[PDB]
Paper text:
Thalidomide directly binds cereblon (CRBN), which was originally reported as a cerebral protein associated with mild mental retardation. CRBN is a highly conserved protein that forms a CRL4-type E3 ubiquitin ligase complex, CRL4CRBN, with Cul4A and damaged DNA binding protein 1 (DDB1), and plays a key role in limb outgrowth and expression of fibroblast growth factor Fgf8 in zebrafish and chicks. CRBN TBD consists of eight β-strands (β1-β8) with a single zinc ion, which is coordinated by four conserved cysteine residues from two CXXC motifs located in the β1-β2 and β5-β6 loops. The central β-sheet (β4-β5-β6-β7-β3) contains the tri-Trp pocket formed by Trp383 (β4-β5 loop), Trp389 (β5-strand) and Trp403 (β6-strand).
In an effort to clarify the differences in CRBN binding at the structural level, we determined the structure of mouse CRBN TBD bound to (S)- or (R)-thalidomide and refined the structures at 1.8 Å and 2.0 Å resolution, respectively. Similarly, the 16 (R)-thalidomide molecules display essentially the same conformation, which is distinct from that of (S)-thalidomide and exhibit a small averaged rms deviation of 0.074 Å. In both enantiomeric structures, the phthalimide ring is tilted against the glutarimide ring by 75° so that two protruding carbonyl groups of the phthalimide ring are docked into grooves at the pocket entrance: the phthalimido 1-carbonyl group into the groove between Trp383 and Trp403, and the 3-carbonyl group into the groove between Trp389 and His381. In sharp contrast to the relaxed form of the bound (S)-thalidomide, CRBN-bound (R)-thalidomide has the glutarimide ring in a twisted conformation, which is distinct from the stereochemically relaxed C4-exo puckered conformation of (R)-thalidomide, suggesting that bound (R)-thalidomide is structurally constrained in a metastable conformational state. The twisted conformation is forced primarily by the contacts between the phthalimide ring and the entrance of the tri-Trp pocket and accompanies a large displacement (1.7 Å) of the phthalimide ring toward the endo direction. This displacement needs to avoid steric clash of the phthalimido-1-carbonyl group against the groove formed by Trp403 and Trp383, and enables the protruding carbonyl groups to dock into the grooves. To visualize the steric hindrance, we superimposed the free form of (R)-thalidomide onto the CRBN-bound form of (R)-thalidomide found in the crystal. We found that the C4-exo conformation of the free form causes serious steric clash (2.6 Å) of the phthalimido-1-carbonyl group against the ring carbon atom of Trp383 (indicated by a dotted line in Fig. 6). The twisted conformation of the bound (R)-thalidomide avoids this clash by shifting the phthalimide ring toward the endo direction (1.7 Å, green arrow). Moreover, close inspection of the glutarimide ring puckering by modelling revealed that (R)-thalidomide in the C4-exo puckered glutarimide ring conformation causes steric clash of the C4-carbon atom against Trp383.
Residue numbers in the entry: 321 to 348, 360 to 427
Write the structure that this text describes.
Amino acid sequence: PTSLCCKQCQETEITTKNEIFSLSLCGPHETLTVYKASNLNLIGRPSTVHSWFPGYAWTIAQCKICASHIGWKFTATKKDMSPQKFWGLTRSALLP
Ligand SMILES: O=C1CC[C@@H](N2C(=O)c3ccccc3C2=O)C(=O)N1
Ligand SMILES: [Zn+2]
């Protein structure tokens, strides 16, 4: 009911509406950023190439059940950043 599940298989809860926060600046969208996620397997090592959140690297994250590409784990390159990690999830890969 606050639950966001992999659209492809509908088995797994990936995150909840409670975990949602915003990195985007409110002064002078398609990607959902959450503090915490579940049931995702990480593929490969982190990379900073073309990172959508400067200062973070990304690791591909797919549903552990059906292997659908739901988003990425973003990890901080520097110790002084917060949060040190979060998830960027493709909204259309989630239900609702
Ligand atoms: O933060 C990110 C993570 C995902 C990442 N990405 C793509 O989705 C992608 C698709 C095809 C080639 C290269 C990339 C690429 O680096 C991207 O451009 N930025
Ligand atoms: Zn799935």
